Amino acid sequence: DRGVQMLLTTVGAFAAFSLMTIAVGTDYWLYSRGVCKTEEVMTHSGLWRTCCLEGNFKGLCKQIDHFPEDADYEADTAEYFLRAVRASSIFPILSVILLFMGGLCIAASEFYKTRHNIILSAGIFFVSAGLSNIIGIIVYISANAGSYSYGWSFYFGALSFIIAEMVGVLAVHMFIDRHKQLRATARA
Amino acid sequence: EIWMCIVFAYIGVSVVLFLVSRFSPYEWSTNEFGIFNSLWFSLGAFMQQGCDISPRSLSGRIVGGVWWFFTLIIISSYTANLAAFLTVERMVSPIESAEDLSKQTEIAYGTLDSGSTKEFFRRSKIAVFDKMW
Amino acid sequence: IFNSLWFSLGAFMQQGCDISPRSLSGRIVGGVWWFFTLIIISSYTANLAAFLTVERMVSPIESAEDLSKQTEIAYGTLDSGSTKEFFRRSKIAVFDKMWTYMRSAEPSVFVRTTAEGVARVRKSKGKYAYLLESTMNEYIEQRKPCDTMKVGGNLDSKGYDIATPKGSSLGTPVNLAVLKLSEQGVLDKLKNKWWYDKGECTSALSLSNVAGVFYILVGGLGLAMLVALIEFCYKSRAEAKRM
Amino acid sequence: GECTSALSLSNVAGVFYILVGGLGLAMLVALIEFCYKSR
Amino acid sequence: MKVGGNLDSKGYDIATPKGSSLGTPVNLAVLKLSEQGVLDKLKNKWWYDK
Amino acid sequence: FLTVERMVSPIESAEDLSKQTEIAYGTLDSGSTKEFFRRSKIAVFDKMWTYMRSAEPSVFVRTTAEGVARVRKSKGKYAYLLESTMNEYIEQRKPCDT
Amino acid sequence: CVDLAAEIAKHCGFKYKLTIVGDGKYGARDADTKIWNGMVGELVYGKADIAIAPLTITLVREEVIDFSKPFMSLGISIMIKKKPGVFSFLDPLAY
Structure with missing residues (x-):
């Protein structure tokens, strides 16, 4: 059903965008033992800062330092580039932006029924968003290379990637259905 | 993390293959790479079990090639690491210090009911010793 | 040409093929390529297994006996002091062999000053080890730039004491x-304050090991999407301009 | 008394030689068949 | 198995009545025996060698 | 399997015998070999002597024939230290099990 | 050492004056003239009344001056000097 499918796409796009925005915003990406507001205390670290949990300074948040220049070590340029990319958080932000563009294209497709090239575009964005998410995830885990458990924000981001992929598939299905219907109509 | 990234990469590869195989109306279909068929092809490629169908377009073949390279590297890494595990036995020590005992709670630990060790533990001014007592 | 490239790529990855050569020459090419692929892939898997197995069995130096056995990493005490006498008069086999290696070694692993010794250890990128008092080692390990580590237990036993003139009140x-301070833990607290409080200092394959293949896969997916988009746009423009 | 590395091309040069020899043999066989058919 | 370092410092000494020669x-x-390393020899013999 | 098999090295010296404990080893109950092992300073010699004294069950053997029999019936869990010439003679005797 | 001296003074109820050894040596007997130096030598000749420093307990020092029970134990110990590349999956085969 065209209406049911469009409702599903809108709901999925909204859910994916909300999940990715929450994952980028909140701090429950990982649980690990570390320093606070700079002893070792079990804190929760996200994408921009880490906050203590059941500690002496519980509730205090300190911005995570992605450039360990205390000893002034550079090693190779690959590590420097990876640290810069992780600190900028460019890929989760790009995933959020691509999801927003996909949702905007989804909304704007309802205005112009004749032009189908918009709907396909939406799907592409969704797919692209998912790819970015995957890259970000890898980068994040690579950032942890230089006990630990993953918080609910990480799983929210993974769910956002999955839902974005599903929405992209269903948008491609809409594009195919629209073009097939147009061909069937114009054949006669 | 490797397994979860494998699952996510498989999902993304299947979606991208289906998109690049079906989205073009000029393809319509000449190929058989639906979403279910894309998932089946990706699963078969990962397990190195062949495929009933193979992509014929340039983009679909690029996707298939990168997925095949990823699958080869991952399977070889799994086999090599399993061989390394089975060759050399490594025995870990769950407890290696007093603060390690203090942080954990699974393993019990105690001193004499009355002696130098217990009285040393009862009255201490160090955080680790205080936690242990 | 495109189909031959696809067949060769599929054969190297040992994946499914939609076509196979039928002529004798094409089948000769296919057979030699298959043999080459089999040998290369088996060699890669075996070399990775050897890499990981040798990595797993690497044993870092943790004891004095381990230092005594292996001679790749040099080690030596000061040119004088109590360490010299202890190693000279030690009848234990491990310490005796340590001393025999120490005296008969070129270049001289001996050092003039403690600061010179720690500097040499730092600039030897792990090739030279130092044998010094455990307290000094613990103090040095807790200083910038966080590169020296005390490993293993003490070789002998000594102590620091409060000195008094003989026959004094x-x-x-x-x-x-001193005994009371030891009992109530003030000595331990002082050691913690002046050594740690004021200091300035697995088996499974990780995602960092195989991050490059993930990057390559995502880049290939993006490139394929871009190529499909370019072809679709060109076809759309051609169709629009044709009619 | 004073007294793993990556696989190099020399380790697998034989398989490369065999591959190139097979390619040359296939080219020769195809050329022979074409000449025979033309004759 | 024994894991980690010693939690504190203690010693075993030879007891002698007060005011005796x-x-x-x-x-x-005791200090001479410790200096020559013989105490380490008895400890190794009665702890690890046996 | 193949890697563990390939890294197994047999004993080819006194030092290798002393370093391990899997295959036991001992000398005659009372003979010049026992006195030589007791009276030595070379590291491997006193390591093997410390193995002798702390061994249980006793690795010492009253007579040469009993020690050869003990080596033979242990299927390779025992080692005998004896005169080189007599040992070379015994190795060249039937049924070639030493 | 300063904190330990303060604790000892508080326990014994006395006031102390800190002085650094003139020659900057721990102290060792000289075989040429049998003259003690360092802090142990300072104590022997009566210049100072008590040494609170990392002074190792040795027989040659115990026979000439008194030593309290050790306040910090030590010994000879070993000091030693202490990430995969992104494309490290190509390592098993040479470039």
């Missing part, structure tokens, strides 16, 4: 004071 |  009271 | 001889003997 301050001897026994100081002895009891 | 054996105490200082005994202290010098």
